[PDB]
Structures are given as structure tokens and as C-alpha cells.
Amino acid sequence: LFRSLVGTSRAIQQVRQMMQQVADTDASVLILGESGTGKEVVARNLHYHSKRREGPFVPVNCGAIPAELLESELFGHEKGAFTGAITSRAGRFELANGGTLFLDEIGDMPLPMQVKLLRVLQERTFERVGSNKTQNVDVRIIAATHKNLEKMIEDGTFREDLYYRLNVFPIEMAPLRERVEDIALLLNELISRMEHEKRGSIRFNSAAIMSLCRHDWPGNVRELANLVERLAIMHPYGVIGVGELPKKFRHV
Amino acid sequence: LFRSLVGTSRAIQQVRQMMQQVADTDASVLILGESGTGKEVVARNLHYHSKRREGPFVPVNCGAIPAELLESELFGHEKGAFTGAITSRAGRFELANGGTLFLDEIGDMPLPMQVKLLRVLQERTFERVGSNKTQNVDVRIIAATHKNLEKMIEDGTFREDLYYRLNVFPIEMAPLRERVEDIALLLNELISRMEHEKRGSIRFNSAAIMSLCRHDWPGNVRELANLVERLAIMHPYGVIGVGELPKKFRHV
Amino acid sequence: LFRSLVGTSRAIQQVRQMMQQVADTDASVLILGESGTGKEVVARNLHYHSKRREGPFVPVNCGAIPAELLESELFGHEKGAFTGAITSRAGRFELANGGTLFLDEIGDMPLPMQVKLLRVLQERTFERVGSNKTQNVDVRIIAATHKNLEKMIEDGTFREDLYYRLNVFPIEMAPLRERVEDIALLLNELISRMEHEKRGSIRFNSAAIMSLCRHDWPGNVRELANLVERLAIMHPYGVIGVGELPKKFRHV
Amino acid sequence: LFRSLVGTSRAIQQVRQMMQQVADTDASVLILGESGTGKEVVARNLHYHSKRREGPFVPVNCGAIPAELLESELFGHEKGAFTGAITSRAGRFELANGGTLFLDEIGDMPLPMQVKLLRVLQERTFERVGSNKTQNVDVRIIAATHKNLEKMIEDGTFREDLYYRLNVFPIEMAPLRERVEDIALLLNELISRMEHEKRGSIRFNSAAIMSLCRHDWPGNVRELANLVERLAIMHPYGVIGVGELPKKFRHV
Amino acid sequence: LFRSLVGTSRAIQQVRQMMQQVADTDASVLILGESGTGKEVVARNLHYHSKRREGPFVPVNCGAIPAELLESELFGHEKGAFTGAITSRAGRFELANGGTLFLDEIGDMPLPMQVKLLRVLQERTFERVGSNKTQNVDVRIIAATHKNLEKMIEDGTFREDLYYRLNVFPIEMAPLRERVEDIALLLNELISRMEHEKRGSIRFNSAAIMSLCRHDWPGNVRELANLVERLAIMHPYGVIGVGELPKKFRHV
Amino acid sequence: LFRSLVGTSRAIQQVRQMMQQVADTDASVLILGESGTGKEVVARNLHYHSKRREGPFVPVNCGAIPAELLESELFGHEKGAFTGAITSRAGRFELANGGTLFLDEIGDMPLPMQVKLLRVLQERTFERVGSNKTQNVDVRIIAATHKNLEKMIEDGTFREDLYYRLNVFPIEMAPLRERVEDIALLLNELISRMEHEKRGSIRFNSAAIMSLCRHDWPGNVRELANLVERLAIMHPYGVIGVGELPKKFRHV
Ligand SMILES: Nc1ncnc2c1ncn2[C@@H]1O[C@H](COP(=O)(O)OP(=O)(O)O)[C@@H](O)[C@H]1O
Ligand SMILES: Nc1ncnc2c1ncn2[C@@H]1O[C@H](COP(=O)(O)OP(=O)(O)O)[C@@H](O)[C@H]1O
Ligand SMILES: Nc1ncnc2c1ncn2[C@@H]1O[C@H](COP(=O)(O)OP(=O)(O)O)[C@@H](O)[C@H]1O
Ligand SMILES: Nc1ncnc2c1ncn2[C@@H]1O[C@H](COP(=O)(O)OP(=O)(O)O)[C@@H](O)[C@H]1O
Ligand SMILES: Nc1ncnc2c1ncn2[C@@H]1O[C@H](COP(=O)(O)OP(=O)(O)O)[C@@H](O)[C@H]1O
Ligand SMILES: Nc1ncnc2c1ncn2[C@@H]1O[C@H](COP(=O)(O)OP(=O)(O)O)[C@@H](O)[C@H]1O
DSSP: OOOOOOOSHHHHHHHHHHHHHHHTTTOOOEOOTOOOOOOOHHHHHHHHTSTTTTTTTEEEETTTSSSGGGHHHHEEEOSSSSOOOOEEEEOOOHHHHHHHEEEGGGGGSSSHHHHHHHHHHHHEEEEOOOOOEEEEEOOOEEESSSSOOOHHTTSSSSOOOHHHHHHEEEOOOOOOOGGGGGGHHHHHHHHHHHHTTTTTOOOOOOHHHHHHHHEEEEHHHHHHHHHHHHHHSTTTTTTOOOGGSSSGGGOO | OOOOOOOHHHHHHHHHHHHHHHTSSOOEEEOOOOOOSSSSHHHHHHHHHSSTTTTEEEEEETTSGGGGGGGHHHHHOOOOSSSTTTTTOOOHHHHHEEEEEEEEEEGSOOOHHHHHHHHHHOEEEEEBBBBEEEEEEOOEEEEESSSSHHHHHHHHHSSHHHHHTTTTEEEEEGGGGGOOOOOHHHHHHHHHHHHHHSSSSOOOHHHHHHHHOOOOOOHHHHHHHHHHHHHHSSTTTTOGGGGOOOOOGOOO | OOOOOOOOHHHHHHHHHHHHHTSSSSEEEEEEEEESSSSSHHHHHHHHHHHTSSSSSEETTTSSSGGGHHHHHHEESSSSSSOOOSEEEEEEHHTTTEEEEEEEEEGGHHHHHHHHHHHHHOOOOEEEEOOOOOOOOEEEEEEEOOOOSHHHHHHHHHHHHHHHHHHTEEOOOOOGGOOOGHHHHHHHOOOOOOHHSSOOHHHHHHHHHHHHHHHHTTTTHHHOOOOOHHHHHHHTOOOOOOGGGGGGGOOO | OOOOOOOOSSSHHHHHHOOOOHHTTTTOOEOOOOOTTSSHHHHHHHTTTSSSSOOOOEEEETTTSOGGHHHHHHEEOOSSTTTTTOSSSHHHHHHHHHHEEEEEEGGGHHHHHHHHHHHHHHHHHHOBBOOOOEEOOEEEEEEEEESSSHHHHHHTTSSSHHHEEEETEEEEOOGGGGGGGGGGHHHHHHHHHHTTTSSSOOEOHHHHHHHHHHHHOTTTTHHHHHHOOOOHSSTTEEEEOOSSSGGGOOOO | OOOOOOOOOOOHHHHHHHHHHHTSOOOOEEOOOOOOSSSSHHHHHHHHHHHTTTSOEEEETTTTTOGGGHHHHEEEEEESSSTOOOOOOEEEHHTTTTEEEEEGGGSSSHHHHHHHHHHHHHEEEEEEEEEOOOEEEEEEEEESSSSHHHHHHHHTTTTTTHHHHHHTTEOOOGGGGGGGGGHHHHHHHHHHHHHHHTTTTOOOOOHHHHHHHTTTTTHHHHHHHHHHHHHHHHSOOOOOOOGSSSSGGGGO | OOOOOOOHHHHHHHHHHHHHHHTTTTOOEEEOTTTTTTHHHHHHHHHHTTTTTTTTTEETTTTTSSSGGHHHHHHHEOOSSTTOOOEEEEEEHHHHHHHHEEEEEGGSHHHHHHHHHHHHHHHEEEEEESSOOOOEEOOEEEESSSSOOHHHHHHSOOHHHHHHTTTEEEEOOGGGGGOGGGHHHHHHHHHHHHHHHHHHOOOOOHHHHHHHHOOOOTTTHHHHHHHHHHHHHHHOOOEEEEGOOOGEEEEE
């Protein structure tokens, strides 16, 4: 259902503490961090330690949904509202009612939908597309982005008013290269997962871990997880020394 | 339905007085001010103290609507008028008939629509897109911007004739850093709202308020409101001293 | 339907006389003047005292129409001619057939359209976009600009041949600061309009009028009209002395 | 059922070894290579040396399926879900259950489907379109592309999280011009196939093979195969010298 | 049943020779040439000099069939498979079994069908739409296009793998303006056809033929044939001099 | 049964002469002209001066028939062939056998039917829908369009091969504004028809006719005919002066 946030670093301890405060509340959470830094972990963790911990956790990827269809995605539609509406559709909001709604990559939401998202977050009502029946929403909002929202406000690509509405309780996730002291602990967690799930086993020697601690991690912890995965295929139940690392991971 | 304009400053008192004069009239109101300075408050307040106080308050965000779709947004469309017009559409004007129409960020309206907006404000008739049936409009106009419209007229990005039509009764909203004497009063209002709505409680000590009075407030009163919100999560029913302020807010 | 040109100045009397000569004819009229100087008044007045006084008065704002769409604007289009042409479109020319076509800010027409406008003004036929069916046009041309067309010819931004075609009967409109002797008469007209239309009433005292006669009037008579409007809100049925003028209007 | 990977080059030997490791596992395989480099060979070979070697090998061409229909393609649909759904439809996943699912040109999958593909690869359940019954999936994933996925992640056209999920065990296929030492061996295989299948026979002389080893091979081994085919029509049971090569293949 | 390829030019002699080689074989033939260059002649000629010369010659115009119906066109369908399937349908493949299948304008086949066409050309089996019964196909493939397939591969509008499958034995048909030395011979053939079929008679004088040899022939030999036809109506049993040519055909 | 082509203009005399040549023949006639230019007159006239002058004149409006039903329209159907085929149906071809078949607005025939129309015009046989019994056709083809077929060939919306088949003997009908010298003669014919049929009488004075000669005639001679009709209602047995013309017809 949820994962815990492994790590010994100051920054990761800050996150844990900030998670305890806000989870129980219904404050809107905005999580800032590079891709793979554990933003969805924090979000799903928040939820199950929240007033809505029995209700629905509803993802919405505001960027991977075609702009023309995002309104129908969020509120739903009845029929005839547009070409192809053969049937009725519940939206994310509907499906999230009584739970948390997770707005994944909020910085990719089109401006038209930013406006409508704000009106709903204010009025707490919405119209399905086509229908003019307004409808009540009960949702705990959690949003995540890796974009600089402040710059986007300046560029006129993100709305100031939405921003201040969503950014009530900001949580910043450090990128992996800024918490390399967490790598060993993260490696252990990632390997237990793999073993618990009967996918395989490995472990890393000290030289390897030193080498990994010097890596960039553009893909951060997800990249880390992928590497564990590849090495378990390549050296099942092996020990990984620096010679078992792929070249781009060696830094001696 | 509406909020009142808290504040003790000379400028905010000017606004109140200017609001009393014009509200009862059907003069077009143009409100100039930075984002978060209470322009929508003034507008919604104006409306409910106006001849249309029973009719519809209809927002239109002239910038957050894609340019190609703004004409359909304002006047409506019938069918077939363009790709996707499966159905009929009432426009903002229609929905605003008998009430006030609020043109949010008028300085982001495309030039084509400035022309058509003026013709309607003059002729007081409009065509739905596609249809050639002209239609009567009864609307009290209220517009708001944070852009320098005079410069835009010079740059050829805003029309002179629209400007003089809309700028009958100009209301200027001071930014927060120019009315810091209002901050305590604003804090009290913002906190009563939060308590009345069972979201929480706080209050600020004198040192904190002095510190806040030295802040820039790029996001003005909306930024202020957001800060109250965060601190209510962080210190429920607490007292905020300068050490409870986020670093960027401390100025001693 | 039309307004008359109030004013006692030599220049405004010249315009009146020049209007009498040309109106009855089908000569092309070019009206030069700063924004708000009454160029559209002269044009609409010309029309209803012309051979086409029963036919359509068709505005076209050559600058407020996106360049890529101006050709479709003028001649019309059939279908398929470009992206989005779901339907048929009559152009301004079509709609102006049997009336006058008013080219507002001709100095903002793109060079491609200057060429096509000239060929039509010569051949007196045109193709809808897409179609290759040529079509007959019966239009009295009236154009207006506040740009120096002669300089634009030099800069290569306005065509010499179009210019000489349109500039058959040039009418120059003096800016307001060059006919301040007309201000009182203009004030009276502007106030009767307001009263006739049940919008309010005011009048100005002599000191106020002296002060107004010393003003720059960047927006000329439209600016004047706007001021009358604001003061009618601020001092309904009042008398305006120089203390009732906005500061930028006081010159004693 | 499957082909073996002929070739003496270092790179092709690497592939063979990497194929032995991963085939027996259920790790996701991503194969990178230009068109015609044998990516489908590697995939079909992998399968029949895998835990699913008795189950279904199910191709899906993520680019040749219209975007609007790809969701129905993968998961299936019940009825009424959209226009034309007269009947029920099993999806690729269903048909691949117990076997391997081969995602041909994964880099052409639309972003909406990347999201849904990832959720299924994680949750290991899916909804047929229309239905809300979730369903279990047992599939070994194999994907292939000739696109630079890393650039696409940067361009925002391919998702980072999908990428790291699919790229557990990357196999890179060298283009033919980088393994020209394999051409003779490839020629022999391609000719035995043709003879075994009673389509004809040829062989190449040394001069011809030298000439072929200097060719670009934009279409790589598939292009090679096509050339063998044409020459068997043109010179049945002949010997191909450089004069029997098409001009663009001669390099002396 | 078939026509022979008249002409004295080098290129037309090449075609004849290439036709002799491939006709007897079951190699796939791809014929490239502008519209009216005799691609269907070459195809029908090929067939009756082929192993399938007693079997069915089955045209399919891959562009003139609506995309949504092309799959049913090729493989057939049973019933219920979609809206309107009241009955059973044999596809082109079925009807072509034991003969040649001619894919006219292959470059207009939608990508979905390119994929399915290739799988059938490989597996040599197919499913009628709806049915899941697979079925054996015995067909000699002949395809024709006037499109640049290589560019289409680049544009991602034609598949590389289909291309290399179909392009085993490429036949290029020169446009008429590149074989004007064939025009007289072509004229004689076209006129004998007309006489043999009791439609009329003409012949051309030398001046006329010189004039025709300087023509563009956008429609090539079909255009030529049409001209013969018109002139036989206009000058029955006449002699055509350059004055009997339509203006666009005169080049002296 | 037929009308004669009144008119004194060069172009109308050309048509008459071209009608004499082709009528007696069985050449396919293509008539190009704007709506209302007398294309059906030419066609019906052609027929009764043709080898089929005793047989059936069979109209088919290729655009006003729903695309899905046009095949059944042309060839007929047996039963069961599709939903609703309770009975047998003869097609236009059948009903036209021994006469002329008039393809009205051929440029609106769907591409699928262009293909089938050509095969029939070549093979001279056809299948009723459903049946597989082929059937002999004896028809003289006459087609008419107001579309640019050459452009449609370019746009891929009309087939090149059909075009060259149908365009054996092209007849172009000038629009009315290009033969205004024919208007008086046309008026006389149109009025005699009306009198002969006891519908009324009028005649036009010289001023009126001059005015009509300056009109656009978008609807050409049909528009002319309609005007005669309206004026006979409005001024029975009257004389029409320019004041009896509708405004849009006055040009002095
Ligand atoms: N602190 C952490 N402790 C344990 N696992 C983590 C941590 N941070 C990230 N992960 C794991 O890393 C991977 C990607 O994290 P994810 O939450 O998807 O990041 P994001 O949403 O920011 O891209 C998942 O496997 C996740 O469980
Ligand atoms: N003078 C004021 N008194 C009370 N509340 C105010 C005042 N000015 C602004 N607010 C509050 O500040 C926030 C933002 O104001 P808003 O009207 O949205 O500004 P704008 O439209 O200019 O961005 C809202 O919470 C609003 O109620
Ligand atoms: N001489 C005049 N007499 C009366 N009204 C005038 C005169 N000149 C201008 N106006 C008024 O001034 C305003 C703007 O004039 P307009 O014709 O729009 O100028 P332009 O087209 O040059 O910008 C309108 O209210 C118009 O009726
Ligand atoms: N190493 C190899 N040994 C034998 N045949 C090969 C090899 N590589 C490719 N082929 C053959 O080349 C052709 C195209 O390969 P394919 O697997 O379709 O490549 P891709 O899927 O990358 O386009 C097929 O005929 C295939 O059997
Ligand atoms: N070399 C040739 N000899 C005789 N007739 C030819 C020749 N090439 C084309 N034709 C004739 O030209 C016309 C059109 O040719 P067609 O095969 O339909 O070309 P395509 O299929 O390339 O459009 C037909 O009348 C055909 O018989
Ligand atoms: N040259 C002509 N002489 C007499 N009548 C004509 C002539 N041309 C057109 N008409 C008449 O004009 C009307 C419309 O012509 P029609 O043949 O229907 O044109 P189309 O088929 O091109 O639309 C009919 O009343 C027809 O009889």
C-alpha cells in the first residue's frame, strides 16, 4: 500500500517530520523534486496516514493526458458533450471523493485547466462536461512537480493564484547526489524488496558503494532501483564489486 | 458572496469611497493592481452593491483561454461553426446578461477580440460564432489588469479605443508593501476566516508583525493569506514569533 | 446612424466642405489623423450621404486581424482551403457589395494584402480563398490611418502604387490640441449625447474649460469623451470647476 | 519458430551471451537498434528459450496502431465503450497471458499509453475499455526501438519512469556497417534459407563480397536479405560478381 | 486480356526484358511510375505470362477504399464483426488465391494495414475480420505506386519492412516526356485499338507529331489516349495537323 | 422533352456547334459550368439528338445520395445484401440501359464509387450489390460539374484515370456575367415559357435590361428565371422598369 522513506540524511529526516505534521491535516501538499526522488512515495505515504486513509488514492498525470481531453478527465462528462461521448464518464474528482487526489506533474497542466482547477478548489463544486449540474467534491489535494513553478509564473505559463493555493505546505525532495550517505540504506531496502518478491538477490561490496556514492544519478533513486535490477540478472546472488558495475557507474 | 476591504491606509480608504460612487452606477470599471492585491474582491463587492446584485457574476480569464477559442467563449456558438461543434454553446455574455461580466486580465486579450469586444460594448449586440442572428446584451462591465495598458497601447498590443471605453472609472489597488500599516488588520481578517471555516487558528506576536511589515510581498495579500495557512498547519493554535516565520520573512 | 462634426475651427470647416464634395462621388477617401480625431465619424458620415447610403457599412481593422487570416477575412473562403475551413465564408468585400468598405488603419495592412487589395481595386474582381471562381465587387472605398504613409513608402513597408490609388481624396483631421477653440462645442455635444441616452448630466464652468483648452489631448476627442464620462459618475448633475478636474487636466 | 544469430563479430557475440543470461529470466528486455538489425529475431529467440517458450508470442506495433485505438488494442473492450463496439474484444495482454508481449517500436507509443502501460507493469492488473472489472496479467515484456529514448525523455516525448522500468536489461544491436565481417556468414545463412524454401539459389564471389563490405546498409540485414532475393531472380543459380551487383552496391 | 508494351526507347526495352525474367517467377513485383505510364499494363501482362496465368487477376485500390473498411476488403469478414455485417464476405486475398493480387497505389495504404499485409506476406495466413479461423493464402504479389516510397519511409508514413518485402523486383516506368520517341508508335497502337473496336479512325501528320513530342504529358500515355479519343470525335477519319491540335498541345 | 440553347454570344455558339458534333456519337460528354448555366439543358438536348433519343434519360445526383447508399443506387441490389434489403432493386445503370446516364455533379462522387464507375465504364459489366451475377450495360455517359476537377485530382479527391475516361469531349458553359449580351434573348425565352404555360406575362424596358446586364448573376440563368417569376407575381402583365427591379438588381 505504501513505502517508507529510508535514509539517514538531514534532508530526508526533515521530510519525515514535515510528513508527520501535514498528513493528519487536509492541507494541500506540493512536493518539489527531480524525477525519481520519491515524490509519489511521499504522496502515497501521506494519504494512508491521513483522514482519507480508507478512501481512494487517485493519480492524475496532467502532462500525459492530451490537453483537449483533460477537462473530461477531471470532471467527467455525460454524453453528446463532444465527438465520441457514446456513454457517461466519471472524472478523477468523482473517483477521488472521500480520498486524496494526486496531481502528478502539475507544472504540465494547461492554463485553461489551471483556472478550472482553482475554481473547483475554491467553490468545491464542479460541472461534468456537457452537464450543467454542479456537484460536490471532497478531496485532499496532493501535487508534485520537478519544474520551477516560480519561473513558470514569471513566464506566464503557470498561474500565480493556483500556485499560492496549492503551495500551502511545500515539501522539497533532495536529489540523490545530495544525499549519497543514504545510498547504502537505499540499496538495502531496494534489495529486500527484490528478495521479498522472489525476483533475486545481490549485495554490493564497499568499493562498489564508494563508486556509486560518486555517481550523478540523473534518474535518482529510480535509476538506483533500475541498476539493482540489472545486476540481479547479471550476477544472481552475486557480490557486486566495482568491476561488476557498468562503466558509467565507476568512479575510483 | 463577497468580502469587505479591510485596511486603514489612505489608499484603501480611497478605494472604499470610489467603490461607493461607482457601484450603484453602470459605469465600466477598470481595476489596476499587482496580482493578489484584491482586484477580484473589489469586483465581486462592486457587483452585489449594484443594479445587477441579484444577477450573475461571470468571470472570464481572457489570458487562460486559448486565443483561437476565446470568441466562442464570449459569444457562444451554434453547431458546425468549427471542428467539434457537436452542440450549442451559450457564451459568457449570455450567461452574464442581467449581471456583471468580469474581464480578468483584460491586458491578455488578443487584439482580434479587443476589436469585437468594443463593437459589442458599443452596438450592445453580438453574433454567436457561426450564427448570423444578432443578439441583445445587458451587462455591467468590470475589467482588471496588472499590466501597464498605456505602454501596451504604445507597443501596439492594446487598442486605444478599447482602453478609453473601459477606463471610465479607474480603480488603482496599492501593492501590499505600500500599505504595510494594513497588515495586522489583514492578518486578523485572514485568521477569522480560517477559524470561522474550522481550518485552524493562530495569531502573531508583535515582533513577527514588525518583521512581516518589512517584507516585499511579491504576491501581496494572497501571499499573506498563504503564509497564514502554512503557519496554521505548522503551529496549530500557536503564537507566531519571528522564529516561527520562514527565513525569507524575517527582517529584524 | 451617423454623427455630425461639431466645431468652429477653420480646419473642421475645411473638412465639412471637403466632405460635401466627395461624399456624393465614388472617389476613394483616405483620412489621416491621430487616434480619436473623428476619422470613423467622417467615414460613417460620408457613407450615409453617398450613393451607397442604403447599403452596408463594413468596417475592417487591418491591424487587429492576424496577418495569416486577413486574406480569408477580405475575400472569404469556401472549404478545405486551409486547416479548419469546415464551412463557407463570405468576406468583407462580399458583405460590403453595394455599400462602402472602411479600411481602418490601412497602414497596418501586411504587404501581401496591399498587393491583393490593389489588384481587386483595379480588376474589381476577387477569388475567395481556395476557390478559383472570380467574383464582382461593387464597393466605395474609405481608408483611415494615423501613420505617416509617405515614410512607410520610403521604408518599403507601404506600397507606392496602393498609396496613389487610395489617396485620391485626402482628408486630414487636426488633433484636438490644434482646435481647442472647438472644445466647448465638443463638450456640449458630448454632454447632450449622454443626457439623450439617460446616462447622466454635467456641465463645466469657464475656469475648467480654460484648463481643458491647455491640455495635450494625446487621445484627442475620444479622451475628451472619456473624461466627460468619468466626471458624470463622480459629480452627477454637478458643475465641474478646475478642482473637479483630475490633476493631469489642470493648467492654470 | 525462431532464427539463430549468425555472425562472428565481437558485438554479435556479446548479444549471444547477453541472450543466454536474460532469456531464462523474466526480466524486461529493451532492444536498441536501427531498422533491420535483427531486433525481432533476438526477441523471438529470447521467448522460445524462456519460461514462456510454450506460450503466445504477441507482437504489438505501437506506432502502426492509430493512437485513439491503441488502448482498446492493448487491454480489449467489452461493448458500447465507444462508437462501433458491436462486440467484445480481447486485447494483446490477454492474448499474451502466459507468454511474452513484444512491444515493437516502443518509442512510438503515445504518452497516454506510456502511463497506462507502466501502471499495468506495476499493478499487474488492467481494465478492458468500458469495463471496470480489473484483470490479472502474466507477461514477459520485450520492447524494441530504433529511437534515442534518452533524447525523447529530454524532449518530454517519452516518460522517464516507463524508461527505467523497461530498460532493466538493455540489448544493443550493431548496424550492419559496423559488423561487415559478418556479411559473408550472413550471406550464407540467407542463401540456405532461400534454398531450403525452394525459392532459388545463388552465391557471391570474393570481389562481390568485398564490394558489399564497403556498403552503407541503411536497411541493414533486411536490406541484405532483399538484395539476395533480387539477385536470385536475376541470376538463378548464378555466381554474383561485382558486375552483377546493382550500381549503388559497387565499391572497388 | 492483356496489352503489349509498344515502344522503341531504351527504357521501354529494359522493362520488356525485366518482364521476361520475373513473370515466370513468383517474386513480388513493385512498379514505380507516374499516373498513366502503363503500370497496370505491365502488371496484367506479367500475370498472364506467369504461373497464375489461368487464375484470378484481382485489383485492389488501397487508396480509394475507406481506411476503416480496408481490412474487411482484404481478408473478408463473417458476420457481426461490425455494424452492418448482415452477411459473409470473401476478401480480395480469397478471390486472388491461385492468381495474382495487384496492389494499386500501395503508397496510399494506411499504416495499420501495412503491418497486417506484411504479416500475411510472411505467415501466408490470415483471419477474416471477426473470425479467429486462420486461412491459407496462395498469391503472386504485384504492387504499383507513383509516390516516393523512400521519402515516405523517412516521413514515417510507409514502413521500412513492408518496403523491403515488396521491392524484391523493382520495375520503373519512364514518364512519357522521357520517351517521346515512342509517341508515334504509341499513336499507332492507340488508333488500331480504336478502329478494331469500331469507335473511329484518325491519323496524325508529321508536323502534329513533332508538336506532340514537345508536350509535357502530365497524364502521360493515358492523356495521349484521351487526346486520340477527342480528335476522333472532332475529325472522324480526318488527318490531324497542328491546327487540329488543341492549343495547349501546339509547340512549333 | 428538351429546351434549345438561346443566345447570341460567341461562347454559346461554340457550345451549339460542339453539341452537333458529339450528340450523334456515343462519346462521353463532360460539361463544366457554374450552377444554373444550362448544363442539364445541354445534356437533355444532347440525348434526344443521339442514338439513344428513344431510350431513357436517367439522372443521378452523385452528391445528394448518401455515400453508403450510392453503390446500391447505381447497380441495384438483390435482397439481404444489407440491412433493410427486403426486396430487389434495379439500379440507375439498368434503368439507363439503351439510353443516356447523366451523372450530375460527378465531382461529388466518393472515391470508392469513382473506382467502380471506371471499372464498369471499361469492362461494361456490373454486379448488383449482394449478387455475384455480372450484367451487361449499354449507356451513353454524360457528366456535369461545377468543381475544378484538375485541382481535385491534385488534392487526391478525384481520380486521374476516371477523369481522362470521362473528359473525352469537354463542354464548357460560360457563366451569365460573361454573356450578358444574351440576357435579352434569354429573357424573351423565359417569358414565352411562362406565357405558354399560362403562368403570367411581363416584359422589361430598356433601362431595366441595362441594369440586369450589369448584375453578377451568382445563380446565373436559373437566378434570371427566378427573377422573371417573382416579377410576374408582383406586376402581372406589367412592364418592368428599373424601379420594379429589386434593389440588388439595380445598377445605373
Ligand atoms: N527514501 C526512499 N526510501 C525508499 N524508497 C524510495 C525512496 N525514495 C524513492 N524510493 C523508490 O524510488 C523509486 C521512484 O520513486 P518515485 O516515488 O516514483 O519518485 P517520483 O515520483 O519523484 O518520480 C520507487 O522504487 C520508490 O519506491
Ligand atoms: N483589503 C482586503 N481585505 C480583505 N481581504 C483581502 C483584501 N485584499 C485582498 N484580500 C484577499 O486576498 C486574496 C487575493 O485577492 P484577489 O481579490 O484574488 O486579488 P487579485 O484578483 O488582484 O489577484 C483573497 O484571499 C482576498 O479575499
Ligand atoms: N467633430 C466632432 N464632433 C462630434 N463628435 C466627435 C468629433 N470628432 C470626434 N468625435 C467623437 O469622438 C469619439 C472618437 O472619434 P472616432 O471617430 O472614433 O475617431 P478615430 O476613428 O479617428 O479614432 C467618438 O465619440 C466620436 O463620436
Ligand atoms: N544475426 C542474424 N543472423 C541471421 N539473420 C538475421 C540476423 N540479423 C537479422 N537477420 C535477418 O534480417 C531480417 C530482418 O531482421 P529483423 O529481426 O526484422 O530486424 P528488426 O526487427 O530490427 O527490424 C530477417 O530476415 C532476419 O531473420
Ligand atoms: N507501352 C505501352 N504500350 C501500349 N499501351 C500503353 C503503354 N503504356 C500505357 N499504355 C496505355 O495507356 C493507358 C494507361 O495505362 P495504365 O496501365 O492505366 O497506367 P497506370 O496504371 O500507370 O496509370 C492505357 O490505355 C494503356 O493500355
Ligand atoms: N442557353 C439557354 N437557353 C434557354 N434556357 C436556358 C439556357 N441556359 C439555361 N437555361 C435555363 O436555365 C435554368 C437552369 O439551367 P440548368 O440546365 O438547370 O443548369 P445547371 O444544370 O447547369 O444548373 C433552366 O430554366 C434552363 O431551362
